[PDB]
Amino acid sequence: ALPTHIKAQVLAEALPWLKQLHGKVVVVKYGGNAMTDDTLRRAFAADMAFLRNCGIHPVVVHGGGPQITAMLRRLGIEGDFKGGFRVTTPEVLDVARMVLFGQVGRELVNLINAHGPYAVGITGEDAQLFTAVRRSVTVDGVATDIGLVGDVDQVNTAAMLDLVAAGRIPVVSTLAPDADGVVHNINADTAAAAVAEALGAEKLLMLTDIDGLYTRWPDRDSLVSEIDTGTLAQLLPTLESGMVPKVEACLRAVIGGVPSAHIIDGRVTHCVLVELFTDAGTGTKVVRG
Amino acid sequence: ALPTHIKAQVLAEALPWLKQLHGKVVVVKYGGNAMTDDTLRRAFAADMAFLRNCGIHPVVVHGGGPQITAMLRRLGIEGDFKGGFRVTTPEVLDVARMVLFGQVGRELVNLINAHGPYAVGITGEDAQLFTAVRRSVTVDGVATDIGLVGDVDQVNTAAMLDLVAAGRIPVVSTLAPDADGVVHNINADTAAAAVAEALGAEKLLMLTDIDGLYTRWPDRDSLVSEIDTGTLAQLLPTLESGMVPKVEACLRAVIGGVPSAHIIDGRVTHCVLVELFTDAGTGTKVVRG
Amino acid sequence: ALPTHIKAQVLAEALPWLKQLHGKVVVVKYGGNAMTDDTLRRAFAADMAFLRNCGIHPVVVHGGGPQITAMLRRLGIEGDFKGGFRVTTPEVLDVARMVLFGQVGRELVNLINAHGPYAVGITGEDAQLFTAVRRSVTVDGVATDIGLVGDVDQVNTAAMLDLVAAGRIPVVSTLAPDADGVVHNINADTAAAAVAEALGAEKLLMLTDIDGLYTRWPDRDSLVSEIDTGTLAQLLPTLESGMVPKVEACLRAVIGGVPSAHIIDGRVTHCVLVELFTDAGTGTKVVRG
Amino acid sequence: ALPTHIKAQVLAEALPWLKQLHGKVVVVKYGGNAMTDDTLRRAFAADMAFLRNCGIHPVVVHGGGPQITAMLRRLGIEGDFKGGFRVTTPEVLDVARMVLFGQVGRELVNLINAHGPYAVGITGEDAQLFTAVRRSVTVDGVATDIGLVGDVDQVNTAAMLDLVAAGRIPVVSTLAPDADGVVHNINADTAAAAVAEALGAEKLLMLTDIDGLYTRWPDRDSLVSEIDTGTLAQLLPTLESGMVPKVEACLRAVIGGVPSAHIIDGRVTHCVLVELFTDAGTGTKVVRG
Amino acid sequence: ALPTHIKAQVLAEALPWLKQLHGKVVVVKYGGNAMTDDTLRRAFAADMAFLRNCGIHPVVVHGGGPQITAMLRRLGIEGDFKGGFRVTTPEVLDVARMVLFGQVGRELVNLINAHGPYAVGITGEDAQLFTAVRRSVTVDGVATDIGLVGDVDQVNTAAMLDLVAAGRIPVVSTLAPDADGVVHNINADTAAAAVAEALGAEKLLMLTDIDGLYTRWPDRDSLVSEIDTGTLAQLLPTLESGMVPKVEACLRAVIGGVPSAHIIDGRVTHCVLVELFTDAGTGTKVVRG
Amino acid sequence: ALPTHIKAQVLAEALPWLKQLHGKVVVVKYGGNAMTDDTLRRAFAADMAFLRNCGIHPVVVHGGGPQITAMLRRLGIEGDFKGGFRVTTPEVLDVARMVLFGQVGRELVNLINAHGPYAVGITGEDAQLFTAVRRSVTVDGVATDIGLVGDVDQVNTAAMLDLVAAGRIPVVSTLAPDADGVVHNINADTAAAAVAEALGAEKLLMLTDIDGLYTRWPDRDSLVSEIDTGTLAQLLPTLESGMVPKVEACLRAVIGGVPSAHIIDGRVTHCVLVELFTDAGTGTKVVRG
Ligand SMILES: NC(=[NH2+])NCCC[C@H](N)C(=O)O
Ligand SMILES: NC(=[NH2+])NCCC[C@H](N)C(=O)O
Ligand SMILES: NC(=[NH2+])NCCC[C@H](N)C(=O)O
Ligand SMILES: NC(=[NH2+])NCCC[C@H](N)C(=O)O
Ligand SMILES: NC(=[NH2+])NCCC[C@H](N)C(=O)O
Ligand SMILES: NC(=[NH2+])NCCC[C@H](N)C(=O)O
């Protein structure tokens, strides 16, 4: 029952964003509900097909922490924990890789591919597309080893951009070999920001389960729609557990040269379309300042 | 004040049409009000930039009958008329070409180019892009010569598609040489359909000053949103003066292989966006049947 | 302690085979011991790097039946069996895909990649590279359904050959969607022959755990080094359980246009090099006749 | 009745100039008689086809001052004059553009195209090929505004050279938008020199209605066949009204890097061929010194 | 002392021939005086540079009968003769190849290369560019073997056209292997016609030591400037010893699809330029009829 | 009678060298016995086909001193000698060029081409592929002129690499023009090293008639399998007449950037294969140090 002139206004408003994005890379960190509820996940897959059919170049990075825990429990693999961290033994790494690449990534490739021959699954292992470096975590303020977990080290930017030039949507499971060929599991938020910077992405989108960034949670009036890196970096020691990784990734990407990073509400159906192609978006847009 | 979920629905509905149009040619016959009121004309130019920034390949064909008459009166060139037709003397042809290519086309190239280096003006004279063949008209049921007017004869499909592959939007003024190099003026509606067929266009759009096709004017309930060629060809001897050329062009194009032709309401702001990227459109869609 | 002139003779003997294979596809069915003992598996990976560094285009197809059974037992998933066949429920399919693509294929990609950025893992799901069609099996001479198992239906030959032209070695896990997007598990021997035919491969190699084809097992003197399709098809109803699938795949590939198919001894270190680059080989070579 | 050995000598003498010009751009300023008498104009068009069929890349820049005045008088548009200059109102600009691009350029495109699909008409408006900057003129030694007239500001060298690489002969009407999109009329002599410098032309040719450059008009013995920029710049304050713009353009182009500039006698049939492919030429050749 | 307007007429007359030849192959049989007198040979080399610098694609085929005889006498190699034919022993073949490719061809490559990096020497041996088939000759009306002499059998048209596309002028010495790799000497006139047909040449030029074709030698009034294949084939049994091979080659080439073949006066300086770029030429032009 | 596992070991040992050489240039100086005994020469030709069919890019440089002397004696051309050097008169140069390019090079092109359309003969004259500069020699410690002999001056690296990219094996006869077009004969050892450096070759191979480099001839225990440039340059004033040119060429090439140079035993059948694809080789390998 929607009037024609309203349809026209919504469509026309996409023009400056289509201009900005045409022929550019967009890295999208996929996770949370958008990946659990069927309506949200089918809409997310459709939105990747949408970007491809505008001449835009999406790259999807996904996680799967809860799926990994679920499979480890099904296999009866007792975990060892340091602080809040499971130690990633070689056994845990094999399960993580098999879950992320062999199950979670598979769901997204198939959903996207209902729309066309677009998606292709990859890890850092394939064609040496990226490497990992082992990382410690701080437990009680002391650096602590927790096994085969790492950060992205180097990215085969040319090989990655060749795949995207071939018209493919890479669906990335974040595992990668270190310099000695030992595969590590990389946090998908930190990986998304590293890939965005390495590929020269125009935007980085990170789907979360909240409306946006509250600077003084739980004050409702502290929600912000736009913020620059300087202001944001001052509030990062203030933020709550959950938002800290998403914010750190937005900061590293935009300071690393990505023109804008977006923390968007993955509970909103077609949140990717709303963030990219409306003026208001549906979350918090981060830019340099 | 428009809710996010409504913005999402309008945007998401474009997906099947972006899939269908990506990398395809769309010929758009530009005329009437869309070319006279400033808001409509700036929106039309913006919509050509829109298609280009989705990876779609627009080709604009324009007329300018009233501008030609206006200039002939300013020059004091007395016309000779047979039935309702001005005879196109060599003098009239020179004025028509100078108005269409040197004024009317120039307005559209500049408007479009406010958005980027897209538009390029051309006639059939440039690079022998298409030729004309002289045509008679029927006056009182007898074939009548009215000077240097013609139909499109042959199209340099390769050279045309090369220009479009270069990322340009051709803005076409319909003049063209015959086999002896004598330039003729071609009716812009018939030319648009000839170009659409020659280029293998996915759609032909024809902007008119009415909501759509009324099959039994003035009965309001005879308006139709979709119709096939068989049904439409049976009503063409019934239709009113104004709709006949637009309908004949839709019939020739779709029978000539163009999957769909559209008679759309040029009085609707961003009518091109509404016709292409909504399910309902804003006019009459013609397909084979 | 090997004399120079002997080294020269072995190397020189490779010339006619390098001529025949340069720029050609070779599909290699990887399985059995060559995939279990560490020395054999590292040699197999090195041989894929060898072919790549001669300008040859290897494509590896692998199975993993025993790994799938092992994982199903670890998960406590009770199987239902018809004749000798496990029914592939949707649950069993998910485990099979996660084992084949997320563990077995991963081992080979990494081993190969110790030599360079060559290997890339793929299934039929990625970029719609190939499709599956559901297959029944004969149990007591009646066609029997055993769940989500299939044959290769169609192959995206162009997209596959593009990946190989990019200098990559595809490591193929044989899962693929049917026409409705439902993923099936395909027997890796039948898949290797289908891929070989579809890609226009020069040779198909199938690694087994025996010296070659005995036409009258267990008679030692019935081993053959070369045989044509006509003679071989007459003995297929005679052969033993294990050799039947390998022989059927060789027959379908060579009749399907692949110049030669090879059943080679995967227990021989560097068996791929020996089969391709010596006159005698190390198994049974099948050609049309 | 011309002896064979004389034909051979004339042809052979072209060799060093064909070597120098092969694959190079030549900008030709077309105007005066060469554009008014039918024999001269058909010969000029034939010479553009000649250069194209030697692998040379001509670019034609034309004026049309007298045609513009003629049309303004036919329309009854009263002019306002400052010194010797007509003020270019928005009305005058529209007429100038419609005359230059819609009539004058059209004649040349058609003449050239009698020889092949070579010529294409363009202004700075098309594909943003070049921009204009507003210019004052000195009237009684004080800077004076005379409306929408300008100099070439920037040139889309890549897009221009792409058109020429496509085998086309651009026929340029010198109108162009300023940074705000407002179209200006540019003096065709100054534009030709700007285009020559921007495209890296090997030569700039300027057709005039005199044998060449007389350094002390009217002394017959002051005619010169070659002169360098240093000597020429010293005589520019000495020269007569008519030669000053042609000389200033030759100076700016050759100092701007064009190896040679030529003021040639447009009254000589095939003057372009004579200047380029004989040692003596038919005018004055300017080089750096 | 030649007037400008005469220079213009000679140059302008080349236009239809430059149009016809642009981007086309011209095979030129080089021999006789044009290869002995220094002025003629330097002019011939300059004319090959001329064609290259018009975008034309010359291919030079040369002989060297007298040079071969001279070298055989210097080596004291006694000849055996059947009728008028020297038997080409393996020894004679080695001398012929070393003279033609190692001396005669070398002179032309160097002369041409004074003008640029154009010429490249080749025989049928190089890259298997063409093969030979052994030929008998008729001695007293009986077929007679005279050793390792042959006709062109097959031509590597693609490899030849690749060399010419690279901007090179092949200078061809007519030796070539038979199917068993045994090199034969091929008559350069017959080879030129075979190469012209194989490459799809626009013209074949054959330099001789006479004004043109006299149909009734020695009657001065029997000289002809143009003749078709039908008329010419009727006079071939009439012609004199010397003209027969040149005429047979023109007939085979034009009947084989080459639009025109030319027997031209190699004693005329720059005869190639005169034949190609004047209406009258300097010899006899053969076309189909 | 060679066991399979031995064949496998020899083949597998080639892998690191195929990796190092894939897509790289190898310059091979061909001379001595490898060019005189039929078995050695056919094996050398087969080895050039081998490298080509691994994706390696061989370039063959040959000499022919003894063949030149033999031909000069057959022609009765009295030589003039300064020290041990024949003065290369213009006559001697013509014979040298005709022998090297017209006989010696021809043998190798044909032998190689028994394997495919690979070999192409060239000198510095063809396409100006390289130039020569005149060189004096030291006779009794005073610089002495000995006619038209020279060193390589400059190399058309792009044109050379284009030929090799086309899949051809250049067979180079070392003659080349100086800056004035006068052709000189260049020592083939010095030329091979100059070409290797200019083309960025991975290896330079020089075939000699000895096992390798003896540092204290005739002490059998002074033979060395590997040596660096620093150690080698200290022994060059110690070495014997024959080895000095081969050693000087290895030194200039490796210091000039070629990773390794090899003096190998041309009396060993398939010595090229043994040197490149075994760890031990068959001679002396020189590297920087
Ligand atoms: N959270 C926001 N305020 N988002 C605004 C997004 C604006 C624009 N669509 C972009 O992609 O940058
Ligand atoms: N007048 C109509 N019913 N139009 C429907 C248009 C549907 C679709 N957007 C198309 O471009 O074909
Ligand atoms: N089992 C055999 N007889 N094998 C012979 C193999 C011969 C050759 N290397 C080939 O790849 O075809
Ligand atoms: N006015 C002259 N002197 N002209 C000489 C021209 C020489 C030569 N054809 C050139 O294009 O540069
Ligand atoms: N012998 C002759 N009549 N020659 C005329 C040659 C005409 C023209 N130049 C051509 O190349 O075909
Ligand atoms: N004379 C020697 N030691 N040679 C060793 C050669 C090693 C290796 N095949 C190479 O090409 O470099």
Q: Which of B288, B217, B272 is nearest to B44 (CA)?
A: B272
User: Which numbered ligand comes closest to the C-alpha of D271?
Assistant: 4
Rounded to the nearest whole angstrom, what is the distance from the C-alpha of residue F256 to the centroid of ligand 6? 19
B15 close to A (CB below 8 A): yes
Pocket of ligand 4 (CB under 6 A): D 17, 203, 225-226, 260, 275-276, 278-279, 281, 283-285
Ligand 5 contact via E227 beta carbon (within 6 Å): no
E strand or H helix that includes residue A134: strand A130-134
Pairing status of strand B169-173 against strand B25-30: unpaired
Q: What does the H/E/C string look like for C227-258?
A: EEHHHHHHHHHHCCCCHHHHHHHHHHHHHCCC
**C-alpha B203 to ligand 2 mean position (Å):** 10
Beta bridge partners of D133: D151
Question: Where does A169-266 show beta strands of DSSP type E?
Answer: 169-173, 175-177, 183-186, 203-208, 213-214, 223-224, 226-228, 260-265
Q: Which two tokens stand for residue C15?
A: 């010339």
The burial class, CB within 10 Å (0-12 / 13-18 / 19+), for A116 is: middle
Q: Which residues of B53-90 are buried (b: 16+ CB within 10 A; e: fewer)?
A: bbbbbbbbbbbbeebbeebbeeeeeeeeeeeebbebee
Q: What is the DSSP letter of F101?
A: I
∠ at Cα D43 (D41, D48), nearest 5°? Answer: 100
Phi-psi region of E38 (alpha: psi -120 to 50; beta: other; left: phi over 0): alpha
Chain A's closest residue to B274, CA to CA, is A8
| Residue D3 one-letter amino acid | P
Residue nearest to ligand 5 atom 5, measured at CA: E281
Torsion of CA F157, F163, F169, F170, to 10 degrees: -60
| Amino acid letter for position E118 | Y
Q: Residue holding tokens 């450096």?
A: F197
DSSP percent split of chain B into helix, strand, coil, nearest 5? 45, 25, 30
Q: Supply the DSSP string of D189-228, one letter for each residue.
A: HHHHHHHHHHHT-SEEEEEESSSSEETTTT-GGGEESEEE
Using alpha carbons, select from B115, B131, B96 the residue that is nearest to residue B169: B115
Q: How many domains does chain C have?
A: 1
Classify strands B149-155 and B130-134 as parallel, antiparallel or unpaired.
antiparallel
Give bridge partners of residue C197 from the DSSP assignment.
Answer: none
Using a 10 angstrom Cβ sphere, with 0-12 exposed, 13-18 middle and 19 or more buried, the burial of residue E37 is middle
DSSP-derived secondary structure letter, F46: H
Q: Is the Cα dihedral F41, F46, F50, F53 positive or negative?
A: positive
Helix (H, G, I), strand (E, B), or coil: what is residue F143?
Answer: strand
Q: At what angle do helices C38-52 and C105-112 cross, to 10 degrees?
A: 60
Pocket test for ligand 6, best of F17, F254, F285 (most atoms within 8 A of CB): F285
Chains contacting A (3 or more CB pairs within 8 Å) = B, C
Which residue precedes each gap in chain F (C to N above 2.5 Å)? none
Q: Is C263 in the pocket of ligand 3 (CB under 6 A)?
A: no
Give the largest Cα separation in chain C, rounded: 61
Chain center to CA of A208? 10
Answer whether D5's CB lies under 8 Å from E268's CB.
yes
Ligand 6: atom nearest CA of F262 is: 1
What is the Cα Rg of chain F in Å? 19
> Looking at residue E177, what DSSP letter applies?
E
The span from the CA of D175 to the CA of F163, in Å, is: 48
Cβ proximity of F274 and F225 under 8 Å: no
Residue A180: CB atoms within 10 A of its CB come to 6
Kindly report the nearest CA distance between residue F56 and chain C, in angstroms. 8
The C-alpha atoms of residue F128 and residue F149 are separated, in whole angstroms, by 18
Q: How far is the CA of F203 from the centre of ligand 6 (A)?
A: 10
Taking the C-alpha atoms of residue D185 and residue D202, their distance in angstroms, rounded to an integer, is: 26
- Cβ F22–C53 below 8 Å, yes or no? yes
Contact at 8 Å (CB) between A40 and A9? Answer: no
- Annotated binding-site members of C for substrate: 64-65, 86, 185
> Quick check: B116 and A7 CB within 8 A?
no
Using a threshold of 3 CB pairs under 8 A, tell whether chains D and E touch. yes
Domain that holds residue A280: 1-289
Helix (H) or strand (E) holding A86: strand A85-86
Q: CA of E92: how far to CAs of E95, E96, E174, E189, in Å?
A: 5, 6, 14, 20
**E188-199 vs E157-165: helix crossing angle, rounded to 10:** 80
- Side-chain-side CA neighbours of residue E179 (13 Å): 4
CA atoms within 13 A on the CB side of B242: 12
Question: Distance (Å, rounded) from C-alpha A230 to C-alpha A240?
Answer: 18
E with B: touching (≥3 Cβ pairs within 8 Å): no
The nearest alpha carbon in chain A to C167 belongs to A127
Distance of CA A192 to the CA centre of its chain: 5
Write out the DSSP string of C17-54: HHHHHTT-EEEEEE-GGGGTSHHHHHHHHHHHHHHHTT
Ligand 6, residues at Cβ distance < 6 Å:
F 17, 203, 225-226, 260, 275-276, 278-279, 281, 283-285
Q: Is C268 on the interface with F (CB under 8 A)?
A: yes
Tokens of A164: 């995207």
User: Residue B168 to residues B64, C255, C259: CA-CA distances in angstroms?
Assistant: 22, 50, 48
Q: Which residue of B has its CA nearest to D71?
A: B75
- Contact criterion met (CB below 8 Å) for C75 and F40: no
| Calpha distance C168→A139 (Å, rounded) | 42
Residue D219, C-beta contacts closer than 8 angstroms, at least 6 positions apart:
none
Residue identified by tokens 């407002």 is D182
First and final CA of chain D: distance in angstroms?
43
Residue E11 at interface with chain D, using a CB cutoff of 8 Å: yes
E85-86 and E81-82 strand pairing: antiparallel
Q: Ligand 4: distance of its center to the CA of D275 in Å? A: 5
β partners of residue D177: D183
Quote the CA–CA distance of A214 and F145 in Å, as a whole number. 89
CB contacts, 8 Å: E130 with chain F? none
User: How far apart, in whole angstroms, are the C-alpha atoms of residue A170 and residue A130?
Assistant: 13
**Cα C176 from chain centroid?**
16
Q: Of the candidates F24, F77, F95, F83, which has an alpha carbon nearest to the alpha carbon of residue F54?
A: F24
Helix segments in C33-187, DSSP class H: 38-52, 65-74, 90-99, 105-112, 157-165
Helix (H, G, I), strand (E, B) or coil at E180: coil
Give E181's contacts in chain F (Cβ within 8 Å).
110, 113-114
Task: Identify which of E167, E248, E191, E212 has the alpha carbon closest to the alpha carbon of residue E30.
Answer: E191
Task: Give the gap in angstroms from C-alpha C248 to the nearest C-alpha of chain A.
Answer: 30
Q: Do B205 and B196 touch, CB atoms closer than 8 A? A: no
Asked whether the beta carbons of residue F166 and residue E168 sit closer than 8 angstroms, the reply is: no
Residue C84 DSSP symbol: T
C-alpha C36/C-alpha C31 separation (Å) is 8
Contact F168, F111 (CB under 8 A): no
Pairwise CB contact (< 8 Å): C166 & A162: yes
Touching status, chains C and B (3+ beta-carbon pairs under 8 Å): no
Assigned token pair, B143: 């074939």
| Rounded-to-integer distance, Cα A50 and Cα A44, Å | 10
Q: Specify the experimental method.
A: X-ray
Q: How far is CA E282 from CA D10, E52, E60, E211, F191, in A?
A: 15, 21, 19, 7, 46
Residues of A within 8 A of B280 (CB-CB) are 4
C-beta of residue B155 within 8 angstroms of C-beta of residue B198: yes
Q: How many residues does chain E have?
A: 289
- Any CB–CB contact under 8 A between B119 and chain D? yes
Q: Which of D15, D50, D278 sits opposite E7 (nearest CB)?
A: D278
**Any binding-site annotation on A257?**
no
**Contact between chains at C97 and A101 (C-beta distance less than 8 A):** no
Rounded to the nearest whole angstrom, what is the distance from the C-alpha of residue D213 to the centroid of ligand 4? 14
- Nearest to residue A120, comparing CAs of A65, A59, A69, A202? A59
Parallel, antiparallel, or unpaired for β C130-134 and C149-155?
antiparallel
The structure tokens listed for D194 are 């700007």
A40 touches chain B (CB under 8 A): no
What one-letter code names the amino acid at A164? V
End-to-end CA distance of chain E: give it in Å, rounded.
43
Cα dist from D7 to D13, D18, D46, D49, E280, whole Å: 10, 17, 20, 21, 10
Where in chain E does DSSP place strands (E)? 25-30, 57-62, 81-82, 85-86, 119-122, 130-134, 137-139, 142-144, 149-155, 169-173, 175-177, 183-186, 203-208, 213-214, 223-224, 226-228, 260-265, 283-287
Q: How far apart are CA B94 and CA D261, in angstroms?
A: 35
Is the CB of B49 less than 8 angstroms away from the CB of A19?
Answer: yes
Put simply, whether E90 touches F (Cβ < 8 Å) is no
Give the Cα separation of B248 and B151 in Å (integer).
13
Q: List ligand 2's pocket residues with C-beta within 6 A.
A: B 17, 203, 225-226, 260, 275-276, 278-279, 281, 283-285
Ligand 1, pocket-test mutation among A21, A285, A287, A288, most atoms within 8 A of CB: A285
Half-sphere exposure of C77 (CA within 13 A, CB side): 21
Residue C278 CA: which ligand 3 atom is closest? 9
For β-strands E223-224 and E183-186, DSSP reports them as unpaired
Contact, D183 vs D176, CB < 8 A? yes
The rounded distance, in Å, linking the Cα atoms of C261 and C284 is 8
Cβ distance C125 to A109 less than 8 Å, yes or no, reads: yes
C-alpha A231: how far from its chain's center?
23
Q: Give me the residue label for tokens 């500039």.
A: D261
The alpha carbon dihedral of F86, F92, F98, F101 has a sign of positive
Residues near F180 by beta carbon (within 8 Å), at least 6 away in sequence: none
Which of D275, D279, D287, D288 is the pocket-test mutation for ligand 4 (most atoms within 8 Å of CB)? D275
User: How many angstroms from the chain centroid is the CA of residue E116?
Assistant: 22
Cα–Cα distance between E266 and E268 in angstroms, integer?
A: 5
Flag whether residue E39 sits within 8 Å of chain F, measured between CB atoms.
no
> Quick one: DSSP state of residue E256?
T
F1 inside 8 A of chain C by CB: no
Resolution (A): 1.8
User: CA A197, CA A195: separation in Å to the nearest integer?
Assistant: 5
How many angstroms separate the CA atoms of A158 and C117, rounded? Answer: 12
